[PDB]
């Protein structure tokens, strides 16, 4: 028997209908720039896979960001690069401006457009109900674009959303875990941050799709409107599914595993137990009430569904009543 297969409900065959070179990133040959065009100014941060710096392009004096890669398999660099090139000019996608290699240490560096980004903690503190709706709509433009272009980000989370509040301007960054969607493909589940992982990853269902990004958007929305970051605070990959089960209930979970005939790691047997599906009110308090509204909760319910096939698409989400104010403006 083994697991029941799955196809995306949308954008299913988009890569099939493209030339091979579009998605066959292992064949991509990288176009190098001149490393001497960029001088590093200061360090902005350490990532899992990179060090990130402010730099100046001495050619034109433009401010630029340089992500110096820690060692990874070349095929993964080509993948990140290919996806960035494919998505360049798309709505609210970071622009890759150049690619250089240190000619001695041989370590590669991606050069990005600069976002004058507001600090993440100071932003998830000052955001009105309207700002959230605005920025969520802006993120969904990025997700609908990338999905329509055959790509799933697989690392949606607040740290990978760069907002310049002063200019009402948003960019979805860090495409280093992104992958091409191909029907029938089994993907690695060891992706995304713990708190943003979909159930499909947690139960080891590999034949997942774009809808993964819609779960992780849900997790973001919840933490923003209920002011609880993270929203699903698991202690590990197993307890993460338990945290989810304590909110969504276990009846839907076991129906989900039954539908796709998922062999469940026996360990999970114990710790899941039996849990009712909770109502969103439990997380409403006087600190957050100004951000919680019936539309917001309707919207959130339709993202956070175990069964990836039944979650909103990006395009559907953008048509939800939560965004009727933003759409008019
Ligand atoms: O690919 C990237 N990866 C990361 N990763 C980090 C990881 C931590 C959180 C956040 C800021 C630092 C530390 C760098 C993203 N940044 C990246 C890109 C980037 C592009 C433009 C830009 N403009 C202002 S900040 C910024 C960052």
From Swiss-Prot:
Keyword rRNA processing attributed: no
Keywords per UniProt: Apoptosis, ATP-binding, Biological rhythms, Cell cycle, Disease variant, Intellectual disability, Kinase, Nucleotide-binding, Nucleus, Phosphoprotein, Serine/threonine-protein kinase, Transcription, Transcription regulation, Transferase, Wnt signaling pathway
KW Iron-sulfur (keyword) present: no
Catalytic activity: L-seryl-[protein] + ATP = O-phospho-L-seryl-[protein] + ADP + H(+); L-threonyl-[protein] + ATP = O-phospho-L-threonyl-[protein] + ADP + H(+)
Residues engaged in binding ATP: 44-52, 67
Active site: 155
Location of region: Interaction with beta subunit: 35-40
Gene Ontology terms: cellular component: cytosol; nucleoplasm; nucleus; plasma membrane; PML body; protein kinase CK2 complex; Sin3-type complex
Subunit structure and binding partners: Heterotetramer composed of two catalytic subunits (alpha chain and/or alpha' chain) and two regulatory subunits (beta chains). The tetramer can exist as a combination of 2 alpha/2 beta, 2 alpha'/2 beta or 1 alpha/1 alpha'/2 beta subunits. Also part of a CK2-SPT16-SSRP1 complex composed of SSRP1, SUPT16H, CSNK2A1, CSNK2A2 and CSNK2B, which forms following UV irradiation. Interacts with RNPS1. Interacts with SNAI1. Interacts with PML (isoform PML-12). Interacts with CCAR2. Interacts with HIRIP3.
Disease note: Okur-Chung neurodevelopmental syndrome: An autosomal dominant neurodevelopmental disorder characterized by developmental delay, intellectual disability, behavioral problems, hypotonia, speech problems, microcephaly, pachygyria and variable dysmorphic features.
More about this protein: Can use both ATP and GTP as phosphoryl donors. Phosphorylation by casein kinase 2 has been estimated to represent up to one quarter of the eukaryotic phosphoproteome. Casein kinase 2 has been found to be increased at protein level and up-regulated at the level of enzyme activity in the majority of cancers. However, elevated levels of casein kinase 2 are present in certain normal organs such as brain and testes.
Family: Belongs to the protein kinase superfamily. Ser/Thr protein kinase family. CK2 subfamily.
Function (record text): Catalytic subunit of a constitutively active serine/threonine-protein kinase complex that phosphorylates a large number of substrates containing acidic residues C-terminal to the phosphorylated serine or threonine. Regulates numerous cellular processes, such as cell cycle progression, apoptosis and transcription, as well as viral infection. May act as a regulatory node which integrates and coordinates numerous signals leading to an appropriate cellular response.
Name of this chain's protein: Casein kinase II subunit alpha
Gene: CSNK2A1
Residues of the full protein shown: 2 to 330 of 391
